[PDB]
Amino acid sequence: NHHVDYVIRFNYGDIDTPEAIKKFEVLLLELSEVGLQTEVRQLFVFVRAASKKKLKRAVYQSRVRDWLYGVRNTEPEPASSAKPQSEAERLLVIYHLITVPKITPRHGEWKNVDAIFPLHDEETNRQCMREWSKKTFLSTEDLDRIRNTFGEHVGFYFAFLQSYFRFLMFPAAFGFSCWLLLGSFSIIYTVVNCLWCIVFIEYWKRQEEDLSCRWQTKGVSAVHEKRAEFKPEKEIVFPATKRMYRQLLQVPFALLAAVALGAIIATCFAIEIFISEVYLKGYLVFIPTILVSALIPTMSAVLLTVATKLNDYENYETQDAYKVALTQKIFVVNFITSYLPIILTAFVYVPFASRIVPYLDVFEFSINPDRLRKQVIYFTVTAQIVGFALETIVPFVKQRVFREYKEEARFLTRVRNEAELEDYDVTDDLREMCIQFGYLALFSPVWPLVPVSFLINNWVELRSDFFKICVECKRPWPQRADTIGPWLDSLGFLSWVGSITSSALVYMFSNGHEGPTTIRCWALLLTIFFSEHLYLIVRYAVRSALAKLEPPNTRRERIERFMMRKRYLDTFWMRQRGWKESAEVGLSLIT
Amino acid sequence: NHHVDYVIRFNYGDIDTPEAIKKFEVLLLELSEVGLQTEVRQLFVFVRAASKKKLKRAVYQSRVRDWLYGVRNTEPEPASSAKPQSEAERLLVIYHLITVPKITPRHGEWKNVDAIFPLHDEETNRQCMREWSKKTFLSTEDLDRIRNTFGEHVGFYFAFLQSYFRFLMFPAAFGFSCWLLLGSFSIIYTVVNCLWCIVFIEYWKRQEEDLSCRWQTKGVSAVHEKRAEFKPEKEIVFPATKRMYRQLLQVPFALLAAVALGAIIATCFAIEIFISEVYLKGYLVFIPTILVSALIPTMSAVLLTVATKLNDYENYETQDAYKVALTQKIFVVNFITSYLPIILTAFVYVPFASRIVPYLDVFEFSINPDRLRKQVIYFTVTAQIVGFALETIVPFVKQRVFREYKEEARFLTRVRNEAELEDYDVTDDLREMCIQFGYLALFSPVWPLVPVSFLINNWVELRSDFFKICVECKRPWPQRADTIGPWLDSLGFLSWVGSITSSALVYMFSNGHEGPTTIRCWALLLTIFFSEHLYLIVRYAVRSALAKLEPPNTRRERIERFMMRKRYLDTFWMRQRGWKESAEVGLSLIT
Numbered sequence A, B: 001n002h003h004v005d006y007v008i009r010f011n012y013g014d015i016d017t018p019e020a021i022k023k024f025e026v027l028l029l030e031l032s033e034v035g036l037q038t039e040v041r042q043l044f045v046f047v048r049a050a051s052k053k054k055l056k057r058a059v060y061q062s063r064v065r066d067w068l069y070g071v072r073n074t075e076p077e078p079a080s081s082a083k084p085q086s087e088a089e090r091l092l093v094i095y096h097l098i099t100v101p102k103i104t105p106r107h108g109e110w111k112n113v114d115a116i117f118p119l120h121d122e123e124t125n126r127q128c129m130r131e132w133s134k135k136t137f138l139s140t141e142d143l144d145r146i147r148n149t150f151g152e153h154v155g156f157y158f159a160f161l162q163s164y165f166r167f168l169m170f171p172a173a174f175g176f177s178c179w180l181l182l183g184s185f186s187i188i189y190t191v192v193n194c195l196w197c198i199v200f201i202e203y204w205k206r207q208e209e210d211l212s213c214r215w216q217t218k219g220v221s222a223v224h225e226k227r228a229e230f231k232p233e234k235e236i237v238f239p240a241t242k243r244m245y246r247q248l249l250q251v252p253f254a255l256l257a258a259v260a261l262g263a264i265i266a267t268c269f270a271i272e273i274f275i276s277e278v279y280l281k282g283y284l285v286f287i288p289t290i291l292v293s294a295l296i297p298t299m300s301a302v303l304l305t306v307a308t309k310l311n312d313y314e315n316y317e318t319q320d321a322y323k324v325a326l327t328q329k330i331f332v333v334n335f336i337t338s339y340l341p342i343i344l345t346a347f348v349y350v351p352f353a354s355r356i357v358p359y360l361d362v363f364e365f366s367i368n369p370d371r372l373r374k375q376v377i378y379f380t381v382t383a384q385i386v387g388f389a390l391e392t393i394v395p396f397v398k399q400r401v402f403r404e405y406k407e408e409a410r411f412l413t414r415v416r417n418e419a420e421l422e423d424y425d426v427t428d429d430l431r432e433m434c435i436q437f438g439y440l441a442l443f444s445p446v447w448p449l450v451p452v453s454f455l456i457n458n459w460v461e462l463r464s465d466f467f468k469i470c471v472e473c474k475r476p477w478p479q480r481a482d483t484i485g486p487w488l489d490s491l492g493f494l495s496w497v498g499s500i501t502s503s504a505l506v507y508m509f510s511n512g513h514e515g516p517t518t519i520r521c522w523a524l525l526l527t528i529f530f531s532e533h534l535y536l537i538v539r540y541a542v543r544s545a546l547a548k549l550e551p552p553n554t555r556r557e558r559i560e561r562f563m564m565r566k567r568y569l570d571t572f573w574m575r576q577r578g579w580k581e582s583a584e585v586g587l588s589l590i591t
């Protein structure tokens, strides 16, 4: 309540006598530029809009600026009827009316300010957290409500997850038939799956071209806020050619992550085989479990600081390209810590365990035949439950218990209890969706009921993720995007390898595993070359098909830019006696 | 001379008494719409511009129309200083001032008119046919001269061929070292070749984005002339969804062309092996040569009429998409009649001739070891000479001899001698360049001196193709394009397979051919999977590198559309006493 748009908190780090001076500078610069800077702090500084006229100029100066960079594409309405018409759109102007240069508190670094965040609208969360908890799919008018608050970068998540949930009803039905009627490893199911994983990619690439155009946000790559942490050396900047000689260093980082995380997973996989040989039994089972659940959360956390100390080398003048180039350096960790402990089961054991059974240095064997099937149960069913309680229930209990040991203006506690909470990142929430797409592409022929396990998940995960933004963490400031970003390029790579891994897995499991038995000459490498090249000419056929059907929300963009230019537009021997005698020459010619 | 812009000829087919009437209609419709329709025919009708004012309106009505469809992107200059400033640009308005509906003679069909064509400017051909016959590369000011006449669709050919000639100096030097120092089949040369074939593709895709922007023609896909041969069923048209159920029939056509042309090439290859067995000797050599040089020119000519009777099924409302969709149906013939007689040598003989020697039904054998090397000489060296004389010298003699047996206004013969000539097609001229790129990608490790054979060719072929447009065939009317078209998509496919075919050819020629000897299990299919997947992550690295460096002619497009929109733009508990008292609250808080 109380018409607050943002708060601005303070750290109290050092000696107060320059901090008296710095408090003026973070307050003089506001009141010279925005209005009604107020504090009933303790320290956090409230901020309002200035007037019902100085705000209306700032909305018009923003609707002009994205127009002439080629986003809005209509004409900007003037300051007479310049109502913001959206709660997220008004909060977006104010944050650009604070964060931008030429105004900055520079909220992360180079000053002494902790965070800037808006306040929740509790009465419209409570009437939606219970509203679409009953429906099985929420409508386009419901998704625009998640756009008119929380910005659009949060809005592309819940529309992706909705469109992911809507297409999962086809493999969940068809995989149910292949489980109940067929057995596993069926040659029909692994073909329909890879044909399914093409259409969902090529539908969503067409779907973003509607939804980033219907929300008037197609082309925001031109309009990105700059990073303060940027070191140019010229003026009207940094040469992009010097990036390529320094982004080339990213490839020795990817070799390092595959060789450091590759060892720790292969070590802890080798030890838990060794209890099947030698073994006290029940005590020693959790010895590889302790080591793998403590080292790769630590070793990956080392590789974040290596990636961060690498990513701040290359300058990346825009804020978006910094977050994208960091995320593409983390997916090589996320590919290798989540798919390697099941590649190493399916492609090492059942090929050969007789070669690696006589090596007894970590102090008769038939293969336990369901080591693979039990392990693909563990992520897609079990870890979807213990991962549900760990991101929603357990941090909700941690924040509730923490307030209980602590215990005209009562909401100054409520703002203070909101200021303690965490801060949402959609990139942290897209990686749990992009990776679990991998198990549906890479390892679905083992136990074909895995799309049923994600169908039940993604209905609940759609609600629990809207739960955690409203009551568990603070409100994200409204951020704009024209796509989900790096993941769409990586959701297509992850279905590439799913065509190689599946069709190689179907051939060996032709009614016998037997870990030197299966032919590889005309069989294994041939069905990889043939299946994967049949993958490519199908996605070439689907992508070239959907590019010929433009959807209506982007057809109304091309027509509307036509009408804009329509309105700015609106602001010597010859003697044959014309044609009546020239035709008389032709009538004379008859032979 | 004589200020003629186009001529319009006539057929004299049927009985003259409605042809008296039809002569009025093709002349009344001109003089109501254009000026100075004149004939000193025999029949062909001259046509001029109307005035120095009615022409200037038509140039302005064309510069407006491509602007508001988003091509010209500046503002159109008004009719005061609306000089056409180009010879091809003035002839382009007149042809659209004749051919377009709502005016049509519809020059191909549904009336009785044969052809419309402009006249050559002989004095500026003669001063350029000898001018750049001395230089080794012609400049950007020389290429604009081939743009300001002959349109732009001819202009993208001579700029592609120039940029192809400029990058061929690197394999011609490096392949000369690999021939003189190394032998054939060297593992270094086949890697640098496939790395070369990526950069030339990814440079030219970046180069068209300059050259179709510097010529003010980026986005002409919006502005295409319609086809008269078009059968809609609605109004404000034909559903594009019905195309996909009928373009699906293109794939059984491609199976038919590979099985009809596949037989005749495999038959005539089998017979010329059979003279190496049984054999009179010298008479019987040319028996497969006669059959293969007479059936595949006939059998392909059948497949044009099948493709044409297929392509007119799907409507293709634009003129460009008809020519593109025909050309993509002919490349499956051109792939299979030009590369199959050397795939079938390299991948059948030296794998196994002992299996196919005992089959003697077409009435000891060591393999003639240079059947492959002598055959790859034949296209890349010999057929480049007998193909030179067959497209330039021999049709020049055919047109010169034909006039000699025949033998105030002398040029009415010159126009009549120009009207007899052939008509140029750039698509017929790009296919001889796109296919000979295939031999440089697909079969370069045999006899590595093949880029020297195309370097000498492409200097001569650049001049002889400019020779044949000026004196051998009539002038093409100025046609616009923003790319070379279908070939750029097919010049990348043709380097895909060149990474598979080369790296498989290096493995079976590791110092022994021996047509069951080479391992294929861990060797042949493995070096295809690894080499080709290393091809893909290199072209992903090159394409993502060049997309980060925008060239200046398209940077001056994005800035210039910014300045266009710049000019159309130019046509309640609160009491804390501002900030000077709000800061006084923070100074009190010290502990």
Ligand SMILES: CCCCCCCCCCCCCCCCCC
Residues within 6 Å of the ligand: A507, A508, A509, A510, A511, A512, A518, A519, A522, A523, A526, A527, A530, A531
């Ligand atoms: C279950 C082990 C038996 C392995 C031997 C059978 C392999 C010989 C038959 C090849 C089957 C694959 C044919 C090539 C792939 C075609 C898919 C496009």
Ligand SMILES: CCCCCCCCCCCCCCCCCC
Residues within 6 Å of the ligand: B507, B508, B509, B510, B511, B512, B518, B519, B522, B523, B526, B527, B530, B531
């Ligand atoms: C010349 C005939 C000899 C064939 C046997 C040699 C094959 C065994 C060594 C494999 C060489 C290729 C290694 C895999 C390709 C790596 C290229 C990325």
Ligand SMILES: CCCCCCCCCCCC
Residues within 6 Å of the ligand: A166, A167, A170, A195, A196, A199
């Ligand atoms: C607009 C949503 C279209 C629904 C199509 C769902 C069909 C799922 C199967 C996809 C083809 C394999």
Ligand SMILES: CCCCCCCCCCCC
Residues within 6 Å of the ligand: A352, A355, A516
């Ligand atoms: C761990 C991967 C290397 C193991 C090699 C196993 C060799 C066993 C003999 C099979 C011969 C191909």
Ligand SMILES: CCCCCCCCCCCC
Residues within 6 Å of the ligand: A187, A190, A191, A194, A195, A499, A503, A506, A507, A510, A527, A531, A532, A534, A535
């Ligand atoms: C579309 C790519 C997946 C096709 C899978 C086919 C696998 C064929 C294996 C047959 C072995 C008997």
Ligand SMILES: CCCCCCCCCCCC
Residues within 6 Å of the ligand: A533, A536, A537, A540, B493, B496, B497
């Ligand atoms: C980038 C477009 C790739 C898909 C089009 C090429 C199809 C490649 C098939 C190659 C099979 C040998």
Ligand SMILES: CCCCCCCCCCCC
Residues within 6 Å of the ligand: B166, B167, B170, B195, B196, B199
């Ligand atoms: C503008 C033309 C650049 C010339 C570059 C030619 C270099 C040829 C070798 C290409 C790299 C393999």
Ligand SMILES: CCCCCCCCCCCC
Residues within 6 Å of the ligand: B352, B355, B516
């Ligand atoms: C023409 C292609 C089929 C020829 C098959 C040759 C078989 C020879 C014996 C080799 C066994 C793989």
Ligand SMILES: CCCCCCCCCCCC
Residues within 6 Å of the ligand: B187, B190, B191, B194, B195, B499, B503, B506, B507, B510, B527, B531, B532, B534, B535
């Ligand atoms: C870049 C793709 C071409 C690479 C060719 C490598 C071929 C390796 C063959 C080695 C066999 C001894």
Ligand SMILES: CCCCCCCCCCCC
Residues within 6 Å of the ligand: A493, A496, A497, B533, B536, B537, B540
């Ligand atoms: C269309 C983009 C294709 C290139 C990017 C994907 C790279 C594929 C490499 C897959 C290796 C297994």
Ligand SMILES: CCCCCCCCCC
Residues within 6 Å of the ligand: A254, A258, A331, A332, A335, A336, A489, A490, A493
């Ligand atoms: C080991 C996997 C390394 C590559 C991860 C995917 C990065 C490419 C995305 C297109």
Ligand SMILES: CCCCCCCCCC
Residues within 6 Å of the ligand: B254, B258, B331, B332, B335, B336, B489, B490, B493
């Ligand atoms: C036998 C070759 C058939 C395919 C020819 C290439 C058509 C695809 C172009 C991308």
Ligand SMILES: CCCCCC
Residues within 6 Å of the ligand: A537, A540
């Ligand atoms: C047989 C090759 C087909 C390729 C189509 C893109």
Ligand SMILES: CCCCCC
Residues within 6 Å of the ligand: B537, B540
């Ligand atoms: C090892 C896979 C690398 C893929 C890079 C696109």
Ligand SMILES: [Ca+2]
Residues within 6 Å of the ligand: A387, A388, A391, A432, A461
């Ligand atoms: Ca989850």
Ligand SMILES: [Ca+2]
Residues within 6 Å of the ligand: A391, A429, A432, A465
């Ligand atoms: Ca979550």
